[PDB]
Design a binder for this molecule. Structure first.
Ligand SMILES: N[C@@H](Cc1ccccc1)C(=O)O
Ligand SMILES: N[C@@H](CC(=O)O)C(=O)O
Length: 219
């Protein structure tokens, strides 16, 4: 069974990416999956299914809905997603860890600027820039291109790394190497996502960085 998020959970996945990005010494074990879930909510449920079926994969679609979970950790209310690939506990521990780093940020700077927040609209796209680097290096059938991925990420995502303490290229890249090796159908989803993304036109810097990195996968 594959999780097929639709456009309605896009804003939620974006905030999930940014929660990981604000976390200092963040456990990026699930970042590859979360990044792939984001691209899927940008494509939508119908396109994702069509992409997978046409590429010869037998896929059992699972609807992604927003659930409210309550747990005593103060009685706290959490907004979570119905994912077969990601438990309610994993999602809630992501929020708990990021709220700790947010509290630390508030103590140091006083008020968090919009571009330093977990709900900045470019958070999901920041994560997907690492995936664009990983995709270029998969052909070698190993992980020898990792040193080059970190080298490029430090240069191309220089401003983004100043904005987020949780933007750790080695960890995020290892997460995408594992997810593309374990679930090769995500490579098809991501390739289809990047071509549809170059059609996007707006004022986002990271949308532009992604469009440039994606075209570098050709030549
Ligand atoms: N003030 C923040 C608290 C928070 C930080 C980090 C993650 C989740 C929540 C908010 O409501 O968005
Ligand atoms: N505590 C508030 C500010 C959040 O966001």
């Amino acid at each position: 069974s594959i999780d097929t998020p639709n456009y309605d959970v896009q804003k939620h996945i974006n905030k999930l990416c940014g929660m990981l990005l604000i976390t200092e010494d963040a456990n990026h074990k699930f970042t590859g999956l979360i990044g792939m879930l984001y691209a899927m909510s940008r494509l939508g449920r119908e396109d994702t299914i069509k992409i997978l079926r046409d590429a010869g994969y037998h896929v059992k679609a699972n609807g992604v809905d927003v659930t409210t979970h309550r747990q005593d950790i103060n009685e706290m209310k959490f907004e979570v997603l119905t994912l077969a690939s990601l438990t309610t506990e994993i999602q809630i521990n992501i929020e708990i860890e990021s709220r700790k780093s947010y509290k630390k940020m508030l103590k140091e700077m006083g008020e968090v600027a919009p571009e330093y927040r977990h709900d900045s609209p470019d958070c999901g796209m920041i994560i997907l820039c690492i995936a664009a680097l990983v995709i270029t290096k998969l052909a070698a059938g190993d992980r020898s291109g990792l040193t080059a991925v970190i080298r490029r990420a430090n240069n191309v995502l220089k401003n983004e790394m100043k904005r987020y303490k949780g933007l750790l290229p080695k960890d995020i890249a290892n997460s995408f190497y594992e997810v593309f090796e374990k679930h090769p159908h995500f490579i098809d989803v991501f390739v289809h996502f990047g071509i549809a993304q170059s059609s996007t036109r707006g004022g986002s810097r990271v949308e532009g960085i992604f469009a440039g990195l994606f075209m570098n996968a050709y030549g």
